[model samples]
Target: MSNTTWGLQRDITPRLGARLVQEGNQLHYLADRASITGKFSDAECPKLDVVFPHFISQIESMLTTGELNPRHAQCVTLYHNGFTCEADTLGSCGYVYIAVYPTQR
Candidate 1:
């Protein structure tokens, strides 16, 4: 699955994981590793009713404008929603980040 590229070397069951490929507007899940209750799609499991225009629009813009480097990036963090969203495109597949934790108050 996509998570295979996420490099989540968790030694536990159902490690919360998430990833996305730009082929389409969606975030795919590693159903086996995430311990999430959702339908599986053989190779990739995308977010429900996923129509991430905002995600795509912003991604492509940054990607082309030099904000995002898909080839290699250690970390990129965005602050909002009372939380820090950090992403690392180390998916060997333009993979993004998994939430490190919940929103802090």
Candidate 2:
């Protein structure tokens, strides 16, 4: 199961059943587009409630690593399986980008 989330000026692809997402701050799942009907609670989906943050933490930890250059990153696979994420940053313009699909692929 895998869920990919996209964002900001740049966009990536969303995941299927594994997609538990949100906007702004506070780790949460606000949307489930993959759900054919709508409303996450209604759809029989695997919410990454305890899983998403772990992946995010892994990415964050990787970003701070000296061996891994966060700035040079366009796409990087996370710790959970071959779960992956892509980013596009205009460093000169301050900071911003996007990512998607961080799951146990």
Candidate 3:
């Protein structure tokens, strides 16, 4: 009974999570045409809501301690699982559009 709302897969690794966050941020910074699906809704976009926290926390940790927490492993696992669940359950056509700040170039 994983209480996770998104039913994300548990195999995601911390390194992969970090890479995904980095790529997402880079896309944002570069103003690239990056779009995330899955769990995006008219009310709340999972891409914006989910990735933002992961990115921010990673950045903060890097700035302060130069190392991300080992706990991020768990966070990534949950995030992936939950995100996938939401995406799958909501169906491909259910994705909601979202805006990201400081578009990448």
Structural similarity to truth (TM-score) of each candidate: 0.43, 0.39, 0.26
Error of 1 at 4 (Å): 11
Q: After superposition, how far is residue 98 of candidate 3 from its true place, in Å?
A: 20
What is the alpha-carbon lDDT of model 2 when measured against the actual structure? 0.41
Off by more than 4 A, model 2: 1-6, 9-47, 66-73, 79-83, 88-96, 102-105
The candidate that wins on lDDT is 1
RMSD of 2: 8.2
- How would you encode candidate 3's per-residue C-alpha lDDT over 1-105 as one tens digit per residue? 233322222333211111122332222232232333334466556555666666445443442354332222211212332332111111122121122232224
Q: Any runs in candidate 3 off by more than 4 Å, and if so which?
A: 1-28, 31-33, 46-54, 67-105
Estimate the lDDT of model 3. Answer: 0.30
Q: Find the 10 residues in a row with the least total lDDT in model 2.
A: 9-18
What tens-digit string does per-residue lDDT give for candidate 2 at 7-102? Answer: 332222342332223233322444533333223452324554455576666544443452333354354434454555554433323333444554
- Candidate whose TM-score is highest: 1
* CA lDDT of every candidate: 0.47, 0.41, 0.30
- Model 1 Cα shift for residue 57 (angstroms): 7.5
